[PDB]
Design a protein around this ligand. Structure first.
Ligand SMILES: Nc1ncnc2c1ncn2[C@@H]1O[C@H](COP(=O)(O)OP(=O)(O)O)[C@@H](O)[C@H]1O
Ligand SMILES: Nc1ncnc2c1ncn2[C@@H]1O[C@H](COP(=O)(O)OP(=O)(O)O)[C@@H](O)[C@H]1O
Ligand SMILES: Nc1ncnc2c1ncn2[C@@H]1O[C@H](COP(=O)(O)OP(=O)(O)O)[C@@H](O)[C@H]1O
Ligand SMILES: Nc1ncnc2c1ncn2[C@@H]1O[C@H](COP(=O)(O)OP(=O)(O)O)[C@@H](O)[C@H]1O
Ligand SMILES: Nc1ncnc2c1ncn2[C@@H]1O[C@H](COP(=O)(O)OP(=O)(O)O)[C@@H](O)[C@H]1O
Ligand SMILES: Nc1ncnc2c1ncn2[C@@H]1O[C@H](COP(=O)(O)OP(=O)(O)O)[C@@H](O)[C@H]1O
Ligand SMILES: [Mg+2]
Ligand SMILES: [Mg+2]
Ligand SMILES: [Mg+2]
Ligand SMILES: [Mg+2]
Ligand SMILES: [Mg+2]
Ligand SMILES: [Mg+2]
Lengths: 247, 37, 249, 252, 249, 282, 282
């Protein structure tokens, strides 16, 4: 009744605040004109400001905008990959809900995956510690969680797989924005990760995949771990929310 | 079929493992599957 | 429809407004004021600092045109034309699943390998339509010898540089296809035949309807104007390509 | 649609030929999407061959009808090449619409599909190898294109940007060959063009794997005579539909 | 030509997903019946084919194609003709979401071909008489097989290999439905048991006997009666997934 | 899909045949033709089924199952239509509470087993002593009575009684007893099959409710008095359809032939199940 | 007249405060102002009542009775709102079946008497032996846990526990036990007051149904397993909200203070009655 429409008026108001920030991700990120109410239009390619000045007005939209702020007060540079994550996790939760499973199961199985994700993003890491950015910390998440969703039982190993499949969005947007074929290069990235390579990822300057880490940007763990943690917190908070009551 | 070192091959299962020679019952054992060293 | 074709249409509109007053002989425009005070003038350098442009893409195009005008006080009405033609062809490219980034990388490569060949046309540049019709063929040959996802954005940077020779001949009442194709047939036997290497100065004549040698006729143009125009039209096309959404507040 | 006389009628005929080709395009190639055309008796016919789709299709537009008759004529005597013919014809028509919207005039577009086509059949009869065979799967439309544009660059006059559009209109056969297999055409064609610039006069689209492949070595062969006949028939269909100025429908 | 293209495979699939959704509620022994009502008749049957399929569904000439191709399973390979319509429906329902990503239908067909080769390559490992044990257990021992080999394919087929895995688990999800069980919970709680203890005989107990082990319930499937379902369904998808147009004069 | 098209037809065929159930049952007037305008008033429940044009296909499974109970038994044609329609009226509720039609069937099977096992223990075989047997037959012939039609019905019932001399009381004793035993079973089964057996019981208690709703009495009170009498040990209570109270159905001489009642139960549950496991009507 | 205007308001105030009942309860987000746009997410059930603007006059009798249970007890603010709203949701049904609101009240009075007389016999006074008393208090403090707010709630509950050392289990044991005793009473009362006590029981079994519907479990199955365990002698079963089964609420250490539970029952039944005997809102 109202639950099944206020879990789809938030998951369709947060998934519309992510597909307004998505193609601004990466070095070759497309700009986006911002139309102010006065009339002047400015151009920026950073998702932080676009969310800063957006007049969201929606509860879940604000929950996702205040996620960028938390992510840049916690790690500094993750302010448009964490929103993309927490909007694709909700995309996956849209299909997981039509199946008929309860939001208190797609909320205790994300923390069942996020805690494994923490232990996947701390193995890739080169202890200085730094992780091989560019798309690796997400294709590895997808692959390893799909491998790990086959050892899990019940409704659990149906949302963790959705977690994995929703991780393959930042690689897709980085491949698109880099002028690649997203599906083909993501499949090649997964096939290169299963074969052992954990440093792989879209090298956006060359225009394709690369293993050599010299021109493969490396990021601290705090940014990726914080992105996972905060995105899972936000999707757990949005899933367990029905009945926006006006006091 | 099944290479045994003292086990691998076209096996989805390992029911029992014993020493006779090392014996391993690979699949559902209807006396058709019997592999030793 | 998307808001990239809208920016392309805005740039094309301001182009079509300015592009009939390009050459030395070019018709005028009338700029009705608010009260109605009309000023009749060619020399788009003013038609761009007096035109009421409200669209954001037309605005950015005007800003980069005026930036070029104040960098060097010439070649500001050709920047807008080349930029809008680049935008037209880039939209035609993107509309067949060629990401705007591949087109932008192609335009960067082309604008960087065009000023490294204009330094084989320099003495000043022959002017007229010589450098454009020469870069057309050179880039159409340099594109195919690359074979990357951006091999198609250099052949739409080479067939869109001949908008200057193609509008310098409708503003001379001569032709559009015939004259430009005789121009692009003389510059072919200046990169294919090594003997006729002096056919690279053959621009077009705006008095008679026939291409002449613009080195034996003194119609030169300073190299730092052509280079700046190609380098600002490229940045304008790129700036209007890298936008893909209009956020409403 | 206006379709009165001149540019409007030509644009109308061009659009009709585009429609009649678009109804067969996906069928081109060894592995091509089928079509489920049903007659008035409730029979379901699944056939991936352009001949058996045009003989079972209602052609109620004049230009489309003439194109389909020329295609059936090619299918009757030769066999192979009854959808490549209509594809080339509709593409020749599609790539001169932007030039016929101005006052270029068809009489001149006709003296560009006859000089260029004669030159292309000359190039075929000069580059064919031995009965005489040329490498199919593209590798000709990707060479005849390179030859025709490199030759049109040396034409002073209006036929430069018409042969150069005739050439660009040959890249569709090596394009929908890989657009039907789902091979990201704008990459395989880029590789083919780059590989035809240097050398490789027999390099065409490979269908077993998403990459270019020397099609002469791979023994994917096409009889030179068949290619010449297909090219001439497609060019003549184009010229016919370009040479039509009005449709005089008898009142009765 | 009306509605041709990748918008004609969302209609062809909405059509072949109706004849499947009706047959999705009759698989197991607890299969809910249907009522035969025509100009004269009141037959209540839950079986298949002529009893259900080929006395209805004259629509889109594609439901007539599913029923046209399911005649090959019955009369000819035992009577396993409900599992091929449900499997084809599931494969097309996953192709519906594979098409949205932008995977050409031919690619999905090649992916289903590779996955069917892997599955039939896995069913013949479980011949235990000629016989593959399992009510809902054969489709969970293959879904586990084609999921592993999926990530060993570097092309777009990998996505199709995974969609084939996700669709093979529909047979042991209409067996969980049609009973008083939860589809996802029961299908997974026995999928996580074929791993972590190697026993492909573990399947859904449609009859509530109590043991989720089809080796002892003695519910069996003839091997060539399963090598057909996995094959005749894929050969039915690759015929419905590749036709691009239905022209009706 | 037909979860309503194949349920409202059934509850309608058993919603117009009710109100003629008890002794003081209402009548129905059958406007049949348009030219040979005919008015026939029917206090019967079988004539309203062998005459009406059945349009819904699910309804056929009830109208052609009442003929079975009428041409193979005699009495018990309005009680296996009304019982089936008030089983398929509580089904609609359970299937609206997201319970699968294949648990309702598994529940109703154990429910009808525990019910047939309940009026069997309460049957009295007075056919041995033929001084009461003569009396019993009069009660069974009074609880069964166009004239020769009803007389033939009474004869079939009496014949079945002489064949199987077991007799169970009527007016509500048998239905309420079976419903009590089904509730006593549904209070001990863990699973979704308990919401189905309680529903079965609520459907069995609908026959005395309709027998009282037809004589003007306060059915919602008399049926509760019956449920309490049948729930504190007493097992012979039942509607006394002469003053609107509950009376001992043994001293009142209101008995029914055990075969008729058991076959009513069996045919009703079987028809309800046969119309339950039907998704689509082709 | 208000048989709906004074009932749907109540079931709405207790239809938005539910789904936050059990441990794994959903949350609600309170869009409060228009200028000082504030977002506060509440897993609590009392904050959603002391904050919302109550428009319906009947709803007031529930929103101002939850304050009583919150400022005079502490825990038990969402269970005397949800219990009252699912008593006034089955009332609506009985009053739609033409039963008078003055028999429903007389039925619910005996029902709450037999329920208060049922969790009283099942209370365990382990406060005497202070080695378990120390343990019990930990269970009652774990079944009660913004931080200091919940801590103050736990302190009030613990104080009431040290005052009255009787403790009854929770998670569903107490509600299911009271519902079993009310059904056992409703099976022995002749009159229209039995359809009211059975309804009372069906309302008591709605608290574990909502505790399970909030953790994703199959409430329609777990509640049936509870009703069978509590109906074949076992009296300590209850929802094990860690794996989705039914577990012994004694060995699992899920207890509640007898005073809190009895006052929940009393306040819920009293509010339901006070909103029942109301025809018109002037
Ligand atoms: N040189 C690079 N190559 C590939 N990916 C990069 C590179 N630099 C940053 N990224 C990616 O960009 C994402 C970080 O988001 P970003 O767009 O930098 O946020 P912001 O909008 O604040 O700049 C991460 O997925 C990171 O992997
Ligand atoms: N007399 C001339 N003959 C041929 N071409 C000319 C002549 N004068 C100018 N041009 C060409 O016309 C082009 C456009 O110049 P114009 O628009 O008049 O001023 P701007 O240099 O500001 O664009 C120049 O590139 C120049 O080469
Ligand atoms: N095995 C192959 N590999 C690559 N290209 C092929 C192959 N077979 C045919 N082709 C190409 O497909 C094109 C269309 O041929 P097809 O549709 O089979 O018959 P038709 O030539 O009558 O249309 C031909 O131009 C040919 O070059
Ligand atoms: N006793 C049983 N327990 C579990 N599964 C069964 C049982 N009997 C049959 N099945 C399963 O039911 C499916 C067959 O459905 P069925 O109605 O036989 O279709 P068809 O009409 O094609 O014969 C198979 O998956 C089979 O494994
Ligand atoms: N005198 C009576 N007192 C109480 N109940 C009666 C009496 N006569 C019939 N009944 C009840 O009325 C019900 C309906 O029977 P009736 O309509 O006569 O035939 P059918 O059983 O075919 O409906 C029977 O179940 C019977 O128990
Ligand atoms: N750990 C637990 N396991 C099972 N049931 C619990 C648990 N914790 C609380 N409950 C139940 O949840 C119900 C709701 O209590 P709660 O929402 O915490 O406060 P209130 O009683 O004010 O609603 C209580 O009746 C209690 O029995
Ligand atoms: Mg950054
Ligand atoms: Mg100038
Ligand atoms: Mg052929
Ligand atoms: Mg079978
Ligand atoms: Mg009778
Ligand atoms: Mg509490």
């Amino acid at each position: 009744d109202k639950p099944a429409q206020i879990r789809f008026s938030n998951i369709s108001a947060a998934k519309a605040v992510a597909d307004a920030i998505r193609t601004s991700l990466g070095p070759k990120g497309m700009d986006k004109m911002i139309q102010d109410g006065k009339g002047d239009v400015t151009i920026t390619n950073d998702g932080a400001t676009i969310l800063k000045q957006m007049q969201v007005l929606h509860p879940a939209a604000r929950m996702l905008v205040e996620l960028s702020k938390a992510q840049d007060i916690e790690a500094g540079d993750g302010t448009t990959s964490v929103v993309i994550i927490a909007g694709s996790l909700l995309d996956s939760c849209t299909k997981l809900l039509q199946k008929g499973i309860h939001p208190t199961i797609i909320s205790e199985s994300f923390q069942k995956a996020l805690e494994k994700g923490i232990e996947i993003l701390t193995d890739m890491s080169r202890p200085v510690a730094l992780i091989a950015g560019g798309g690796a910390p997400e294709i590895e998440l997808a692959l390893r969680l799909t491998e790990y969703s086959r050892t899990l039982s019940g409704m659990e190993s149906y949302c963790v797989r959705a977690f994995a499949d929703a991780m393959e969005v930042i690689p897709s947007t980085l491949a698109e924005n880099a002028g690649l074929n997203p599906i083909s290069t993501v499949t090649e990235l997964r096939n290169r990760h299963a074969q052992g390579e954990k440093t792989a990822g879209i090298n956006v300057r060359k225009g394709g995949i690369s293993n050599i880490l010299e021109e493969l940007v490396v990021q601290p763990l705090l940014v990726s771990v914080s992105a996972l943690t905060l995105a899972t917190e936000t999707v757990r908070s949005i899933l367990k929310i029905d009945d926006v009551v006006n006091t | 079929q099944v290479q045994l070192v003292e086990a691998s091959g076209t096996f989805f299962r390992i029911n029992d493992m014993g020493w006779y020679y090392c014996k391993a019952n690979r699949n559902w054992g209807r006396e058709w599957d019997d592999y030793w060293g | 429809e998307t808001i990239r074709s809208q920016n392309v249409m805005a740039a094309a509109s301001i182009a079509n407004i300015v592009k009939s007053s390009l050459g030395p002989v070019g018709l005028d425009k009338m700029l009705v004021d608010d009260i109605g005070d009309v000023t009749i003038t060619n020399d788009g350098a003013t038609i761009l600092k007096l035109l009421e442009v409200e669209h954001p893409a037309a605005k950015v195009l005007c800003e980069l045109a005026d930036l070029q005008d104040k960098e060097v006080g010439d070649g500001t009405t050709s920047v807008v034309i080349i930029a809008a033609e680049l935008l037209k062809n880039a939209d035609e490219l993107v509309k067949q699943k060629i990401h705007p980034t591949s087109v932008i990388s192609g335009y960067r490569l082309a604008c960087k390998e065009a000023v490294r060949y204009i330094n084989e046309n320099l003495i000043v540049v022959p002017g007229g339509g010589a450098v454009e019709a020469a870069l057309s063929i050179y880039l159409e040959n340099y594109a195919t010898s690359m074979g990357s996802r951006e091999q198609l954005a250099i052949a739409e940077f080479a067939r869109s540089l001949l908008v200057i020779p193609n509008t310098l001949a409708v503003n001379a009442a001569q032709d559009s296809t015939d004259l430009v194709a005789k121009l692009r047939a003389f510059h072919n036997e200046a990169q294919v035949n090594p003997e006729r290497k002096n056919l690279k100065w053959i621009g077009l004549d705006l008095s008679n309807g026939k291409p002449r040698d613009n080195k034996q006729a003194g119609v030169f143009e300073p190299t730092i104007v052509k280079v700046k125009s190609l380098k600002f039209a490229t940045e304008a096309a790129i700036t209007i390509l890298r936008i893909d959404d209009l956020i409403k507040l | 649609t206006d379709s009165s006389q001149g540019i409007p009628q030509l644009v109308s005929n061009i659009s009709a030929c585009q429609v009649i080709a678009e109804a067969v395009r996906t069928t081109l190639g060894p592995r091509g999407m089928d079509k489920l055309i049903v007659d008035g008796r409730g029979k379901a016919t699944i056939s991936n061959d352009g001949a058996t789709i045009l003989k079972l299709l209602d052609v109620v537009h004049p230009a489309a009808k003439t194109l389909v008759d020329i295609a059936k004529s090619q299918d009757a005597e030769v066999g192979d090449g009854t959808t490549s013919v209509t594809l080339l014809a509709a593409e020749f028509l599609k790539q001169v619409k932007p030039y016929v919207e101005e006052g270029l005039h068809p009489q001149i577009i006709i003296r560009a599909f006859r000089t260029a086509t004669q030159l292309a059949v000359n190039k075929i009869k000069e580059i064919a190898v031995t009965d005489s065979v040329v490498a199919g799967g593209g590798a000709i439309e990707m060479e005849l294109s390179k030859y025709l544009r490199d030759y049109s660059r040396t034409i002073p006059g209006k036929q430069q940007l018409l042969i150069g559009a005739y050439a660009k209109a040959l890249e569709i056969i090596p394009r929908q060959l890989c657009d039907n297999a789902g091979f990201d055409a704008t990459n395989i064609l880029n590789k083919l063009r780059a590989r035809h610039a240097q050398g490789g006069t027999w390099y065409g689209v490979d269908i077993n794997n998403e990459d270019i492949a020397d099609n002469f070595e791979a023994f994917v062969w096409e009889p030179a005579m068949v290619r010449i006949n297909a090219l001439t028939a497609a060019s003549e269909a184009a010229c016919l539909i370009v040479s039509v100025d009005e449709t005089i429908k008898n009142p009765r | 030509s009306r509605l041709m293209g990748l918008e004609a495979l969302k209609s062809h699939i909405m059509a072949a997903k109706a004849v499947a959704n009706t047959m999705r509620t009759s698989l197991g022994p607890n299969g809910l019946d249907k009522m035969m009502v025509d100009k004269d008749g009141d037959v209540t049957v839950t079986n298949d084919g002529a009893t259900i399929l080929s006395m209805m569904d004259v629509d889109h000439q594609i439901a007539k194609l599913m029923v046209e191709l399911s005649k090959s399973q019955d009369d000819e390979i035992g009577d396993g003709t409900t599992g091929v319509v449900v499997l084809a429906g599931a494969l097309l329902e996953e192709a519906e979401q594979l098409l949205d990503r932008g995977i050409h239908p031919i690619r999905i067909a090649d992916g289903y071909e590779q996955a069917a080769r892997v599955a039939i390559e896995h069913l013949d490992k479980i011949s235990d008489s000629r016989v593959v044990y399992g009510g809902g257990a054969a489709e969970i021992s293959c879904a586990l097989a084609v999921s592993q080999e999926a990530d060993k394919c570097p092309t777009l087929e990998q996505y199709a290999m995974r969609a084939f895995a996700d669709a093979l688990e529909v047979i042991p999800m209409a067996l969980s439905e049609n009973s008083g069980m939860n589809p996802i919970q029961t299908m997974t709680e026995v999928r996580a048991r074929q791993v972590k203890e190697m026993n492909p005989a573990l399947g859904i107990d449609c009859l509530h006997k109590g043991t989720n082990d089809m080796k002892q319930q003695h519910v069996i499937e003839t091997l060539i009666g399963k090598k057909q379902q996995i094959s005749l369904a894929t050969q039915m998808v690759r015929m419905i997934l590749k036709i691009d147009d239905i022209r009706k004069p | 899909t037909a979860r309503l098209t194949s349920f409202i037809g059934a509850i309608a065929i058993g919603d117009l045949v009710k109100s003629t159930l008890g002794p003081k049952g209402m009548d129905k007037i059958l406007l049949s033709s348009g030219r040979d305008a005919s008015l026939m008033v029917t206090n019967d429940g079988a004539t309203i089924l062998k005459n009406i044009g059945v349009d819904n296909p699910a309804a056929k499974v009830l109208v052609d199952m009442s003929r079975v109970q009428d041409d193979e038994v005699g009495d018990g044609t309005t009680s296996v239509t009304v019982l089936a329609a008030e089983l398929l009226r509580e089904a609609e509720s359970l299937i609206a509470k997201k319970i699968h039609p294949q648990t309702i069937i598994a529940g109703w099977r154990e429910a009808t087993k525990a019910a047939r096992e309940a009026l069997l223990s309460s049957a009295v075989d007075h056919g041995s002593d033929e001084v009461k047997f003569r009396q019993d037959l009069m009660n069974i012939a009074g609880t069964t009575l166009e004239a020769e039609r009803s007389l033939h019905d009474a004869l079939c019932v009496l014949a079945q009684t002489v064949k199987d001399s077991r007799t169970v009381y009527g007016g509500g004793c048998s239905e309420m007893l079976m419903a009590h035993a089904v509730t006593q079973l549904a209070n001990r089964t863990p699973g979704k099959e308990a919401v189905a057996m309680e529903s079965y019981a609520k459907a069995l208690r609908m026959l005395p409710t309709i027998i009282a709703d037809n004589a003007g009495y306060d059915s919602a009170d008399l049926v509760a008095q019956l449920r309490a009498a049948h729930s504190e040990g007493n097992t012979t209570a039942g509607l006394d359809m002469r003053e609107g109270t509950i009376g001992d159905m043994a001293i009142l001489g209101i008995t029914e032939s055990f075969q008729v009642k058991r076959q009513v139960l069996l045919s009703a549950a079987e028809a309800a199940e046969v119309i339950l496991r039907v998704d689509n009507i082709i």
